[PDB]
Design a protein around this nucleic acid. Sequence first.
RNA 1: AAAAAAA
RNA 2: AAAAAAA
Lengths: 60, 60, 61, 60, 60, 61
Amino acid sequence: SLQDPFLNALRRERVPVSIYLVNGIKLQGQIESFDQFVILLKNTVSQMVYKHAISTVVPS
Amino acid sequence: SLQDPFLNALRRERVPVSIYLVNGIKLQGQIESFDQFVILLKNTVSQMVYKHAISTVVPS
Amino acid sequence: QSLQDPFLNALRRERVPVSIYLVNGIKLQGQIESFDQFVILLKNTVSQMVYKHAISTVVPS
Amino acid sequence: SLQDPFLNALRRERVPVSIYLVNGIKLQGQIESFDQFVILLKNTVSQMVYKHAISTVVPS
Amino acid sequence: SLQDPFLNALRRERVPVSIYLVNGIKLQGQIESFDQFVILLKNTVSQMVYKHAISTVVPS
Amino acid sequence: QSLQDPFLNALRRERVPVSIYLVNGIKLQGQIESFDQFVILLKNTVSQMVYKHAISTVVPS
RNA sequence: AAAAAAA
RNA sequence: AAAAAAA
């Protein structure tokens, strides 16, 4: 698996990320955690993002 | 699984939530219940939202 | 589980007017006639088979 | 258990149908055959339609 | 299955095809090959198209 | 994936500039760094993770 | 087929 | 959240 090491590196190093959704919308924050189906993305608030809705995850 | 505790905390504490859909539409209400495939969001009425149609779930 | 089946079953077994919003934002209206694992039969003037994968939300209208 | 008898009746009786795609596009033909993932839609020329791209099937 | 014999006939007989995508874009070419998840479409180049992105496959 | 793996392998091994069209019409460009069952790592000025479910087509640029 | 409408 | 842009 490539997801877990990629996402964990971002979380452990607390790098600012952009999550681009499939609808073109760009979410920004830090990766708090993730499982098989979701990523929790945090700024001032934690939100649950469904991977099915994500196109890409990119360091900001 | 991160999904069940995230949703259950929202449900159990009656948090006002925003559910953003993959078509960019924002729904608002409280998480009434959920299962493997759907979330029941209650404002004036209970509406069943398929998780496949959801991009994000956020406290409002 | 399970919430989906009892929610649809009550709408069906009570013949309640519903709106089914599709993921593209089109709103379909009528009554839940029937459903299975993958589809919902929506009865109006003509009865139609709606794929669940295309549905965002089901609500009483 | 509901999808297959529905599609089988349209096929057997050669019912003119509309297949609305998830992008709103409306295809018209009669259902030639179908399997788990696709439907063959017949008009002048026959075309294979992926179910994942279909929203609804309705007699025309 | 009717999908494999449908695609196989197109490939074997080198029939010019239109592949309509879920975003409404129309691709044209010959079916070079396919597997469970993708189709290789040949026009001026060979391109790998994910089936999940495809609405319809039609002889042109 | 007897077609998918050799196609991506050749682009990665040969460091071929690629274009990835997403299902929403947006085109990404870069080189394929690696890929697995669900994602492609695409590298340009940075490495980004692209979900395959969001991809329509991969082609050499 | 808008390197991407914090919706 | 155009009962639906044969694309």
